[PDB]
Symmetry: C2
């Protein structure tokens, strides 16, 4: 199942939404992503796409980059995957 | 309209699973070199465009380094991705 945060993200183009609009990305993860250059949601989408939507590699990259746990990275992957199914 | 028809066709609709050669500026020669480096679908190149925060200088140099694109090819590819994003992202 899904959070409302997920459903809100997948419902519409992301535009310039901050990285914190992604399901799974809370205040702490968002800071660390911003610290490393991923300040907008679309930059994380960029990494998802460069990695050819590979779940294992994206979730591992997120853990290595901002410390996401398994639930957080599951949530973030799922929200980007569903967004892409609707808009890409 | 000074863009190519090929630009117009790409920016008119979501890209889905389109191959990299659907991008403006990406002919068969550049497209093969991109595919050999793992950039086989247009959305993978979109991904690089986005990871570079849509920066023209960085993206155009990355394209040159990765497939040998010249100035016009890299401008066309960048402009096609930028307009696609303005329409759909």
């Amino acid at each position: 199942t899904t959070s409302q945060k997920h459903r809100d993200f997948v419902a519409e183009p992301m535009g310039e939404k901050p990285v914190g609009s992604l399901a799974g990305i809370g205040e702490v993860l968002g800071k660390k992503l911003e610290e490393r250059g991923f300040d907008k949601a679309y930059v994380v989408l960029g990494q998802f796409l460069v990695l050819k939507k590979d779940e294992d590699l994206f979730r591992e990259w997120l853990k290595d980059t901002c410390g996401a746990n398994a639930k957080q990275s599951r949530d973030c992957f799922g929200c980007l995957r569903e967004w892409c199914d609707a808009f890409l």
